[PDB]
Amino acid sequence: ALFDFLKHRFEGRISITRVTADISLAKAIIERSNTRSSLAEVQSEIERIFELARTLQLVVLDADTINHPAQLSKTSLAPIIVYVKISSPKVLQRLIKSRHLNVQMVAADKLAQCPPQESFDVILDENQLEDACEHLADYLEAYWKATHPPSSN
Amino acid sequence: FCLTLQNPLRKACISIVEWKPFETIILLTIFANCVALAVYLPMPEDDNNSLNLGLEKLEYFFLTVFSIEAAMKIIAYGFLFHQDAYLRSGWNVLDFIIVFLGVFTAILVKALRAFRVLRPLRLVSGVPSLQVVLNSIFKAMLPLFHIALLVLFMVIIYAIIGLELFKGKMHKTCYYIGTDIVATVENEKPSPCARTGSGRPCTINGSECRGGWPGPNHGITHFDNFGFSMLTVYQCITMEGWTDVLYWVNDAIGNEWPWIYFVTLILLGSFFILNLVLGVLSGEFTKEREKAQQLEEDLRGYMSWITQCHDLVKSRVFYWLVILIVALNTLSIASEHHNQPLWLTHLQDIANRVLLSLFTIEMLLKMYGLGLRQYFMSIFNRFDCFVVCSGILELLLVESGAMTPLGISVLRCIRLLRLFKITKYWTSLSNLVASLLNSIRSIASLLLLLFLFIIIFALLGMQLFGGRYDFEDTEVRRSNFDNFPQALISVFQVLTGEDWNSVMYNGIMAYGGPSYPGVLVCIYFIILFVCGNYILLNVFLAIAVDNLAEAESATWFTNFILLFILLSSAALAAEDPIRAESVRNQILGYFDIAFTSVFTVEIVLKMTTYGAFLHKGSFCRNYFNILDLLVVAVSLISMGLESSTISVVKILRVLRVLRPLRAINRAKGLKHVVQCVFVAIRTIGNIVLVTTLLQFMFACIGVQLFKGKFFSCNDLSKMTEEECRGYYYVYKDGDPTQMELRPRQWIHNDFHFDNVLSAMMSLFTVSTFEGWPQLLYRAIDSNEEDMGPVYNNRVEMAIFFIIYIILIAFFMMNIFVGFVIVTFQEQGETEYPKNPYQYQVWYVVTSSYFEYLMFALIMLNTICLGMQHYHQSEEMNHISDILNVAFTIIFTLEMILKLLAFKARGYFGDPWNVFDFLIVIGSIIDVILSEIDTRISSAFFRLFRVMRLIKLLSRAEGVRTLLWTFIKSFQALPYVALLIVMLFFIYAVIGMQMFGKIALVDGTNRNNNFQTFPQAVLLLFRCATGEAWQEILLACSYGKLCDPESDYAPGEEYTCGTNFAYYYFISFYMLCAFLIINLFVAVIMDNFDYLTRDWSILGXXXXXXXXXXXXXXXXXXXXXXXXXXXXXXXXXXXXXX
Ligand SMILES: [Ca+2]
């Protein structure tokens, strides 16, 4: 739903794209992933990001494996991490029950531990779609103003 | 401990009583008591009786049941059982019932019936937590006791003082002589206080009508007995009707300074009730000093998160940006209603069909809101209905989608309730309002106990006053407990403190007038609001906590000239000169002379001040001056003074006082309270808006429910305010042999609800707690369009006034609390030898065995003062002379004794002794004046003889010290008082000509004339007290003809000499209100900000006792170790304490 907002609002600018490879894997025996996600494919996806960012269009990845910001710390990509906060574990308990919960609790409790000041640029702790979307959209507009000075054109 | 005790069946029956059901039975049968009695009150009127006549057995039924529970009490714990409080009172009531009907059986009186009303308290007795509540209320009374006595002290001190001059006036009030048209001279020999009346004459006869009584016709208030003076002092303390005491006394010699007495009395009763408020708030700070949902919200909001053709409407559930812009458009729609709620209402009496097509617009707004609720229904279906507010607003818009049906026009009036939907805005303010309402859940129980006190007092009242009720001649009688609801409205009346007085003088008058048993009836009212208002005062503390819980949550040469200190010194002499000149102008007649030089002076000061503005303006002001209050004040001083006398009224001379006011800024102490005030108005502005909106709400309520009403006739005997015409009899008193014609009818009832503006008008009057019941009562005479009558028609309407008043009891009460809290933070911001025989006599006197002796002497003097009955004739008077001689000799003797001591220090040293010396002096002087009697000022000297009582206060240690706290407190706030004078000092003069020449008569404007300046100070002083101002306001809308002896106008007269000027009184009440608010905060910061802490210390530590320890240190020297040894005994003794 968040990518839906980012897409319909940032139409003609945003360039959301899926990344099947695990970009966190990216960094005299040659290094090789033991995972099915081969490092060379990861290098290819990183080059695809280098090409996609060349157009100076907005980019918002939909990476699957990236459950925590720290994984991307080794990446040269310098991702704009977003933090959709749920401070209360019991709430997310009732949420996931409302429809694998325990590992979801360890993970959410893990993301609760993280330092907001550095690990995350934005905290989507807002409950309703409207206000949260207004915040993240205003943020992306701020970054958009930051990346596109008048002198460039 | 128990008693007797037995096994067998008793333990089994007790085990049965240990169960459960019996409780509910006793409680519900108590409820049966409440109901049966509430009915039983209806009616009475001595004998007759009706339905209750059968209930008469039923109380025996309750009797035997409760008595069976007493048989259970035999199985309880006997003497051990007595220890419980609730059980104690229960057993007590049991005795009252046993003795009750036990006496009743022999009868085969009414006091027993009075004892019947004791039952309801048992309802509290059965209820848990109410015991916690009352155990809480009892704790509150202790930290107040001193002041209570002080009140009583004043109540005594003024009484004894009243038991002199006013007793000297008791010689006046008790009698009169007069004749002819009621034009006998006031206050100049052969003159007397008059009965109120619309005319007053008092047939007696005594020539052509008498002319002066007030001890019974006015009711008891006479100063004769000490008791009645104690009474009149109570009502005068109540700040209710007291001014009539003044105009009475003043009617009969004279306008010296009775006013000094009443003003000191009012101001002090004010002072110390404010101190009561301080004690309560002190309890608040006491409890709070140590006293100092997100999960579920996340749950609901994130479930809403996961929750996220008709499908296009589902896209419309979030879409789009226009939904924001549409809200701006929505502001228009409700706005159309904002006028319509008035427009459908306006005007009245079928005048002006303003809703010529407004109904279609109402249908249109209903269509828009219905479209919104429908699209919202499309947004999430049942989930949209899951929120109660959405279905509520939808049900409202659907309610507007209904029809003209039916006969209940109040359903059409619910459209005004539909206007509440417009209150949906105001972001965050609603949350604060929720914080406000949350307190109600806490205070509600205590409110219920208040309802209970109201209940018992009401019923007992019904069986007392209304338990006789009857009073032949001559209306309106008003409320008089003739029926249960009547007693409700009237108990709630005196509870307000509004005009309870007249109720009471129906009370005592009901028992055949004053004597010995009937006067005792007075005690009820004294028991009543004095505790009842106290209960209200108690209510403050509740809010006081709850609210704090939220708080817990070559131009350079001229530059040298203006900046020169010498120029400021010439400005200072100019200040004293212009002040002396304006003070010279304070009299109205000063302009008649050569005031022009003073105008030149004020012109010079205005010139130097505007020049100061010119100096500051050149140094980075302007926009800063637009920001700064001061330079803007000076520039505004420059422009506003320049306003022309032509086109829109102005008077430059009145501004002459203003020029020195800037010097008040140099004082810093005012700035703290002022900054506190500006911080305060911002702190609770939203509440003010809420109140005003309530004004709108009840406005809309009253208009579309009362508009046809109130167009009163004379009397009820005309009904149709159009059938009214021509003359109309008035029979004086009651006898049908004293007719007087009158071209009567119709009546506008002074406060139409023909208009929502007029609604703001009258509703403010009831907001004042002043004069409303009259409006209430005539509101109860309402029916249809042009008709009044009758008696108790349409009683349901009475429910309304009360309801609104109840809300006034909330937010107003909240308002005052708000200030306090900031101050509490502001306080936190504030926190940021002998020789020879003389050696012998000194030893004898210093021992202070005489202290108890002299104390007893003083008290005996007090009782000798209690002797003061001014009946007839003499004998005892000479005795009183002998007594005064006795005490004066004893006292002067004693002062001689003290004189035989330090002498050089006995004549001073400790100051009260000097005061005592003063006492001896005035005493002896007055005695000699008595010797010379073989003169009027001698009364003023006998005052000094009365002043002795104060010496009792001198003995009142750990009490007078609190007054010393008041003393240290007294100084700093005084600066505000000048403004408190000035606010009058301006407006009075501002009014002195404008409302001047209103003619003396007999309206609200006689002995209360607006003429000379000081009397104007008074008439503006009544308004400070909430004393029937509205009537005075009503007089001023058009008034009478000049002073009927002044320059008048020309041939013109016809009462044309006065015109509309509501703004003056209306604004003044508010200015007075805010200024007094400032008085509160000033007193608080200068006293309780320390003094409440002083209560906390005196109640726990020993900061006060330490001074006494220093007094022990007096009996010593200054070292060395030997001093430590000599003081070792007193030291070893002291530490144990
Ligand atoms: Ca009053």
UniProtKB/Swiss-Prot annotation, chain A:
Subcellular location: Cell membrane, Sarcolemma
Tissue: Highly expressed in heart and brain, and at lower levels in lung.
Top-rank lineage group of the source organism: Eukaryota
Family stated for the protein in its record: Belongs to the calcium channel beta subunit family.
Subunit-level organization: Component of a calcium channel complex consisting of a pore-forming alpha subunit (CACNA1S) and the ancillary subunits CACNB1 or CACNB2, CACNG1 and CACNA2D1. The channel complex contains alpha, beta, gamma and delta subunits in a 1:1:1:1 ratio, i.e. it contains either CACNB1 or CACNB2. Interacts with CACNA1C. Interacts with RRAD; interaction may be involved in beta-adrenergic regulation of heart rate and contractile force. Interaction with RRAD regulates the trafficking of CACNA1C to the cell membrane. Interacts with TMIGD2. Interacts with CAMK2D. Interacts with CBARP. Interacts with CAMK2A.
Function of the protein: Beta subunit of voltage-dependent calcium channels which contributes to the function of the calcium channel by increasing peak calcium current. Plays a role in shifting voltage dependencies of activation and inactivation of the channel. May modulate G protein inhibition. May contribute to beta-adrenergic augmentation of Ca(2+) influx in cardiomyocytes, thereby regulating increases in heart rate and contractile force. Involved in membrane targeting of the alpha-1 subunit CACNA1C.
Protein name, entry field: Voltage-dependent L-type calcium channel subunit beta-2
Species the sequence originates in: Rattus norvegicus (Rat)
Parent-protein start and end of this portion: 299 to 467 of 655
Swiss-Prot record, chain B:
Residue ranges annotated as Cytoplasmic topological domain: 76-84, 128-144, 368-378, 427-445, 607-622, 668-686, 901-910, 957-974
Main location: membrane
Region (Phenylalkylamine binding): 1053-1095
Motif (Selectivity filter of repeat II): 496-499
Keywords, in A-Z order: Calcium, Calcium channel, Calcium transport, Calmodulin-binding, Cell membrane, Disulfide bond, Glycoprotein, Ion channel, Ion transport, Membrane, Metal-binding, Phosphoprotein, Repeat, Transmembrane, Transmembrane helix, Transport, Voltage-gated channel
Tissue spec: Detected in skeletal muscle T-tubules (at protein level).
Stretches for region Binding to the beta subunit: 293-308
I repeat residue numbers: 7-285
Sugar attachment sites: 48, 205
Region (Dihydropyridine binding): 744-832, 1041-1099
III repeats: 554-824
Residues in compartment: Extracellular: 40-54, 167-227, 250-257, 336-346, 399-407, 466-485, 508-517, 575-586, 642-648, 707-756, 778-794, 871-878, 996-1015, 1035-1060
Keyword hit for Membrane: yes
Membrane topology field: Multi-pass membrane protein
Domain notes: Each of the four internal repeats contains five hydrophobic transmembrane segments (S1, S2, S3, S5, S6) and one positively charged transmembrane segment (S4). S4 segments probably represent the voltage-sensor and are characterized by a series of positively charged amino acids at every third position.
Protein name: Voltage-dependent L-type calcium channel subunit alpha-1S
Species of provenance: Oryctolagus cuniculus (Rabbit)
Gene name per UniProt: CACNA1S
